[PDB]
Each structure stands twice: as structure tokens, then as C-alpha cells.
Amino acid sequence: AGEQLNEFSSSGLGRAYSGEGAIADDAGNVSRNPALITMFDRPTFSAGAVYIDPDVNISGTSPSGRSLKADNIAPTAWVPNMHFVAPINDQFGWGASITSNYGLATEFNDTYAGGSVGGTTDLETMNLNLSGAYRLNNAWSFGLGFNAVYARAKIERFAGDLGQLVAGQIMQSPAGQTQQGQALAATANGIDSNTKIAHLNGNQWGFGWNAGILYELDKNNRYALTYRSEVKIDFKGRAFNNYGLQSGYLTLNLPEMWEVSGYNRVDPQWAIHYSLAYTSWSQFQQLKATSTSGDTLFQKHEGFKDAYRIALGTTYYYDDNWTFRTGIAFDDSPVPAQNRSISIPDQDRFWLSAGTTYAFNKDASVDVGVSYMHGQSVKINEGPYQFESEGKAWLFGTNFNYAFHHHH
Numbered sequence: 001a002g003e004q005l006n007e008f009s010s011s012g013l014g015r016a017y018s019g020e021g022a023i024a025d026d027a028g029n030v031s032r033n034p035a036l037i038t039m040f041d042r043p044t045f046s047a048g049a050v051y052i053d054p055d056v057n058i059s060g061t062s063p064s065g066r067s068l069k070a071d072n073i074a075p076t077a078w079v080p081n082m083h084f085v086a087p088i089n090d091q092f093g094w095g096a097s098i099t100s101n102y103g104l105a106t107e108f109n110d111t112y113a114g115g116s117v118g119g120t121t122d123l124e125t126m127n128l129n130l131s132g133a134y135r136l137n138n139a140w141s142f143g144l145g146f147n148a149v150y151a152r153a154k155i156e157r158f159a160g161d162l163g164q165l166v167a168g169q170i171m172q173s174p175a176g177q178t179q180q181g182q183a184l185a186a187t188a189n190g191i192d193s194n195t196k197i198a199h200l201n202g203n204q205w206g207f208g209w210n211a212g213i214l215y216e217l218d219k220n221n222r223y224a225l226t227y228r229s230e231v232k233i234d235f236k237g238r239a240f241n242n243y244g245l246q247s248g249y250l251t252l253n254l255p256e257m258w259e260v261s262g263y264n265r266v267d268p269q270w271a272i273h274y275s276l277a278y279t280s281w282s283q284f285q286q287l288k289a290t291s292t293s294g295d296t297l298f299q300k301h302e303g304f305k306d307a308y309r310i311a312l313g314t315t316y317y318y319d320d321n322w323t324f325r326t327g328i329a330f331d332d333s334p335v336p337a338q339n340r341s342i343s344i345p346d347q348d349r350f351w352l353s354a355g356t357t358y359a360f361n362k363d364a365s366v367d368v369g370v371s372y373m374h375g376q377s378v379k380i381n382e383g384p385y386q387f388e389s390e391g392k393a394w395l396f397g398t399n400f401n402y403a404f405h406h407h408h
């Protein structure tokens with residue numbers, strides 16, 4: 001939900017990210033549950049990317065009379081992933097990954113009437129993870145990971161029609177009957193809609209941790225509990241070399257997430273897998289801007305917001321070479337209209353997914369996945385404006401998998 005991204009692997013994409021704490025058919029899942037490291041008996045690599053093509057549209061009419069229509073506000077994106085896992089001994093293993101689990105991009109024309117809450121918002125994050133795991137016995141494994149997150153932001157806001165709203169208010173007041181009041185209203189109305197009123201561009205690192213437990217009933221059936229911590233990102237605004245002769249502030253808290261997962265291989269050729277994930281934020285979505293020495297201070301309201309996601313999928317292990325998968329998911333995000341933001345797509349999301357993997361041999365394989373996401377149409381009440389939003393997306397991904405130390 002919200003800015004969350006689940007796109008850590010292309011096999012996961014084909015399953016609608018169902019039971020991802022409990023499946024370990026490739027290296028990608030260690031990033032989702034570090035305890036899964038104990039399911040690997042040789043160094044294993046995976047890398048790939050997911051292309052996301054959203055279609056998000058805003059509609060409405062301002063109290064000024066101006067249109068709030070904005071089509072196609074969410075651009076396409078590529079989300080890469082790379083994973084490595086290796087055993088150390090019978091009891092221990094480690095892994096590393098580069099993924100993203102948070103990101104946002106919307107863009108409105110700079111003459112948009114709702115520009116004070118529209119403009120541009122681009123948040124990109126890269127999660128570097130190092131994880132370790134311990135196998136206690138045949139049933140129990142435990143994992144712990146540490147995360148370094150590199151976050152880039154670009155945020156711009158514009159006057160839009162605010163001056164027109166002010167002008168109207170002045171004209172409606174007793175001041176509207178005076179020459180001075182009329183002049184003030186004209187001054188307000190004269191403000192260009194593309195006047196920039198807030199700006200942030202920045203790059204910052206933050207840190208967090210994650211952990212996981214894995215319980216195996218047997219080689220065919222297992223369950224997992226995982227936790228991912230919040231990550232706090234604090235954006236803040238030679239000579240040598242000549243041979244002798246970042247703007248804006250914002251504290252952003254990435255959300256914490258708990259997830260339970262199950263995987264049951266009910267037949268040599270069939271598995272089911274499912275999960276419930278619970279995400280909480282310590283901030284609301286809307287932004288307030290002030291300034292200090294001409295630099296923008298952005299602030300989100302400190303408040304508790306949550307969401308949950310349920311997912312169910314199945315994997316058909318057809319033969320030695322071919323695996324097929326499908327899944328369905330629902331991500332429920334119950335944000336009140338008055339707490340939503342046009343700059344941040346947020347709505348209930350329904351997933352339908354399908355995928356396949358082709359294994360060239362026991363060491364090497366390729367995954368291809370596709371998902372369709374249907375977004376709920378929602379009302380948004382932000383600042384002086386009322387909007388409606390509609391959204392959907394297609395996602396396409398491919399990964400290559402390779403396990404080292406071929407021998408026989």
C-alpha cells in the first residue's frame with residue numbers, strides 16, 4: 001500500500017507475492033526472510049528487474065472553478081533486484097541483496113490548479129541488505145539482517161489557483177466593497193499558477209534491521225514470521241583542485257512490516273503459498289511546507305496509519321524444466337478521504353498474477369512474471385480541494401538464477 005513496493009523478485013511477481021517468507025525455490029526470498037538462508041546448500045545468485053506501468057488519473061473541480069483533471073500522473077519505473085546467498089557451515093549461512101521496498105513518483109503540469117498539493121514528487125530508494133542465519137535443528141531456523149537505505153527525493157509544489165481562492169474570499173468579505181480590498185484581491189489573483197512555492201532535492205542514507213523465523217514441518221511444508229523495522233531518512237539542505245584558486249528539509253519514516261507466510265507442497269507437482277502482511281506508518285501522507293532562510297521545510301503529520309495485504313498463490317512444478325505459477329492478492333489501505341494525497345497513489349489494490357520459470361539445468365534458470373493491479377477509485381480531500389482518483393497498473397519482470405559449484 002501507499003509507497004510500498006513488493007518487487008524484490010520476478011518469481012514472486014508471478015505468485016502475486018504470496019507466502020514469500022516461506023518459499024525458497026530461488027535466492028530472492030532471503031531478502032524477504034533471512035531465516036530462509038538455511039534452505040540453501042550452495043552459493044546461489046539471482047538478479048533481474050520489474051517494469052511497472054501505472055495508469056493513475058485525478059479528477060475534480062476547484063472551488064475557484066478551475067479543473068482538477070490530471071491524466072496519467074504516475075510514470076513508468078524499473079525496479080532492479082540482485083541477491084546472493086551462501087552457506088558457511090551446517091548451522092550458519094549468509095546473504096546479501098540489493099532491492100527496493102519503497103518508492104513514489106507522480107507529476108502534474110506546473111500550471112495545474114491544485115499545484116500546491118500537486119507539482120512533482122519523486123522518491124527513490126535502494127535497500128542494501130546483509131543477512132545471517134542459524135539453523136537450530138531440522139525444524140527451526142532464525143535470521144537477522146541489517147539494511148542500509150539510500151533515498152533520493154525531489155519534491156516541487158506550485159501556487160496553482162491559491163491566489164484565486166484568496167481573491168474570492170477577499171471579494172466576498174466586507175473588504176470586497178473597498179478600493180483597498182479590491183486591490184489586494186487583484187494582487188492575490190495575479191499570482192502565476194506556475195509560481196514555485198516549495199522545493200526539496202536531496203540524497204540521504206538511513207538504517208534499519210529485519211528478522212525472521214522459519215518452522216519446517218518437513219521438507220514439503222513450512223511457516224514463517226518476519227519483521228522489518230522502520231527506517232528514518234532525514235533530508236537536510238577544492239580549491240585543491242583549482243591548484244589553489246541539496247536543498248530542503250524533510251524527515252521521512254519508512255514503514256515497519258510484519259508478515260506471516262505458509263508454503264505447502266501438496267503433491268510432487270503442486271504447491272500452495274499464502275501470507276498475511278501488516279504494515280504500519282508513523283506519519284500521515286499530506287505535506288505541510290514552511291521555510292527557513294528561503295529553504296523549504298516539509299513536514300508530514302505524526303500519526304498512526306496501517307494497511308494489510310493478503311495473498312494466495314499456487315505453483316505447478318510441471319517437469320524438470322518448466323514451472324508455472326499464479327496468484328491473487330488484496331492490499332487493503334483504509335485511509336480516510338481527508339488524509340489522502342493526490343501526490344501519493346493510495347487505494348485498495350487487487351492483484352492477479354501469472355509466471356513461469358525455465359530451468360536450463362540444475363544450476364541455471366530464468367523467471368518471467370506478469371501482474372495486473374486494479375486500484376479502487378477513491379475520494380481525496382486535501383487542502384481546499386476535493387478530488388477523485390482512479391488507478392491501475394501492469395507489472396512485468398524477469399530474473400536470471402544461477403547456483404555455483406556444478407559438479408558430479
Ligand SMILES: CCCCCCCCOCCOCCOCCOCCO
Pocket residue numbers: 063064065164165167168169171172182185186189
Ligand atoms: C467559498 C469560497 C469563496 C468564493 C469561491 C470563489 C469563486 C469566485 O472567485 C473567483 C476568483 O477570481 C479571482 C478574481 O478576483 C477578482 C478580481 O477582479 C475583481 C475586481 O474587483
Ligand SMILES: CCCCCCCCOCCOCCOCCOCCO
Pocket residue numbers: 128129130146147148207208209229230231
Ligand atoms: C548493508 C547493510 C549494512 C548496514 C547495517 C547497519 C544497521 C544499523 O542499523 C540498525 C538500527 O536501526 C534502527 C532500527 O530502528 C528502530 C527500531 O529498532 C531499534 C531497537 O533496537
Ligand code: NA
Pocket residue numbers: 053054055056072
Ligand atoms: Na499510462
Ligand code: NA
Pocket residue numbers: 060061067068069
Ligand atoms: Na475537469
Ligand code: NI
Pocket residue numbers: 332333334348
Ligand atoms: Ni478497503
Ligand code: NI
Pocket residue numbers: 406407408
Ligand atoms: Ni558437468
